[PDB]
Amino acid sequence: GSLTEDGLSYKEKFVVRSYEVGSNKTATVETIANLLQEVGCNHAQSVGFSATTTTMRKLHLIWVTARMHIEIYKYPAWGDVVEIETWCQSEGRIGTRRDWILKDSVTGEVTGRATSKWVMMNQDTRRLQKVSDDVRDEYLVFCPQEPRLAFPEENNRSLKKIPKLEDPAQYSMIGLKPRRADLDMNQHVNNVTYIGWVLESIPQEIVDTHELQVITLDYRRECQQDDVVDSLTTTTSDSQFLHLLRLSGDGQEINRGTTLWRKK
Amino acid sequence: GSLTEDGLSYKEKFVVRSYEVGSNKTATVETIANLLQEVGCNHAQSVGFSATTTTMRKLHLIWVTARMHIEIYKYPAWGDVVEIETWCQSEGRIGTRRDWILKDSVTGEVTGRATSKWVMMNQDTRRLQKVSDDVRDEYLVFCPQEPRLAFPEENNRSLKKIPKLEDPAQYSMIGLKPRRADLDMNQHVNNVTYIGWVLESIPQEIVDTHELQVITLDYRRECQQDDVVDSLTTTTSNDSQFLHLLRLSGDGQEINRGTTLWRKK
Ligand SMILES: COc1ccc(NC(=O)CN)cc1
Ligand SMILES: COc1ccc(NC(=O)CN)cc1
Secondary structure, eight states: OEEOTTSSOEEEEEEOOGGGBOTTSBBOHHHHHHHHHHHHHHHHHHTTOOOOOHHHHHHTEEEEEEEEEEEESOOOBTTOEEEEEEEEEEOTTSOEEEEEEEEETTTOOEEEEEEEEEEEEETTTOOBOOOOHHHHHHHHTTSOSSOOOSSOSTTOGGGOOOOOOOSSOSEEEEEEOOOGGGBOTTSOBOHHHHHHHHHTTSOHHHHHHEEEEEEEEEEOSOOOTTOOEEEEEEEOOOEEEEEEEEETTTOOEEEEEEEEEEEO | OEEOTTSSOEEEEEEOOGGGBOTTSBBOHHHHHHHHHHHHHHHHHHTTOOOOOHHHHHTTEEEEEEEEEEEESOOOBTTOEEEEEEEEEEOTTSOEEEEEEEEETTTOOEEEEEEEEEEEEETTTOOEEOOOHHHHHHHHTTSOSSOOOSSOOTTOGGGOOOOOOOSSOSEEEEEEOOOGGGBOTTSOBOHHHHHHHHHTTSOHHHHHHEEEEEEEEEEOSOOOTTOOEEEEEEEOOOOEEEEEEEEETTTOOEEEEEEEEEEEO
16 A cells, blocks of 8 residues: 555555455455555555544544445455555535545456545544644645545435434344454444444345445444444335434434445 | 465465454454465465365365364564465365464564364265265375474364363353354355354453463354354463353254463463
8 A cells, every 4th residue: 555646645455355255256345345444544554643633632532434425336356456545635624534436456447436424523522523723734734635526426425314214114133233353443343343234134135136336324323342233224216225223222323324236 | 375386385465454453453363264264265276276176066065164273472463464374284084174374474483373174065965074085186286295284293282172161151142143244155154253253252351451372163063144143151270261162042052162272461
């Protein structure tokens, strides 16, 4: 991996691993999501971050994912090389955005794209704080000044309002728990595990006959390592689904999302 | 990755990823186990396998893991480079063995080692069988002829008989289920998931104060994607030792037994 010539974005190549592929001999969407997360971390390290700034560590402030949107046109097989380009952008006082472009390293064609919204939070009180002027200045020297969007189109899937699934759900997977492998270096559940949990309630026949083209996921609350999750799905339609992750006990919402699947 | 000069072993380098590390800022034993599996698959591909031979595919035969033994002296941090060397060896009609040596690519020092026993099974009936002469000749051209052991020592930990945990277990983690990420390309539960399930019943205080040095795991039966597992652990012991058992949640059918050795940080 390396920052590009202008130093305002970062590229990295990954050779797809044997254990990273699913039943259709291609990388799972969870493998793709882990690769996006890895190239984002490597971009942060290359420009001097932990992605907390100096002001943020003094104030006990962190960036948290509010939304993840991923569109995949082609999944890579075991042995294939995926090139990922990533960059960040300030969105005023609302927060920050991280975007990705996925390419087949051999042909140079675009095989996918992703966008994510991040909000500022106090790590102890868990209260959202709105971006301050001091923090914005520290982040802007690493971001392109003119807008650079992975999803530019006016009225695109990435900025759609997602509704709350109504009981009863058409499909469900109950009693989902994280294990130690699902936790990051700070003992928090990895954001990619929530994507896996959402997809657990899609029936196996859809997975066997369709490929996932689009996934939009809102993050409302964290799931703790001792929490239990229920995954709910309803067909809204290509096949489209509405999703809800909630705590098994009280029914507290942790995530809501939508998926779009194409017939193979 | 590449086969070595003599073509009888395979080497590969891996840079440790941000999502591959645990609470200690080092690679989890599950990340290590996935890397061993990846370098084993790349070794098989480099010499023409897919690791069924031509005779095995004709007779609906597969290699299945009977035992996995891993010893780690040092865990790599995010950004570190781990070099893994792997090779195979015939063990007569009992089966085959795959061995690994893990090194720090920068210093060249040995940071870990692993050995695994594989038995032949008919894919459909699930019946184990001894290795035939025709199969033996087909993989001996890819194996060193003189013995080459990652665990050469006489009374080494890798060949120890593991007992069956007696109820009640000291610790337990109940209702463990695989998700789609835990399944391989053939929709079978990945062998590394069983290692994670065994470790789920170790208390968090041991994980917070000790590092895993050794893990020996016997594979008795396969867990299906719609099966539920219970993970059981009892302390048997500076060092901490545990006895482990994975069994199906319903009938209590054994799927795995194992032992772990942990050293104080
Ligand atoms: C109430 O505000 C929020 C709280 C939590 C999140 N996200 C996560 O904690 C998921 N990693 C997003 C917004
Ligand atoms: C009946 O004998 C055996 C059955 C299964 C295994 N191993 C695995 O299925 C590992 N996933 C080993 C021996």
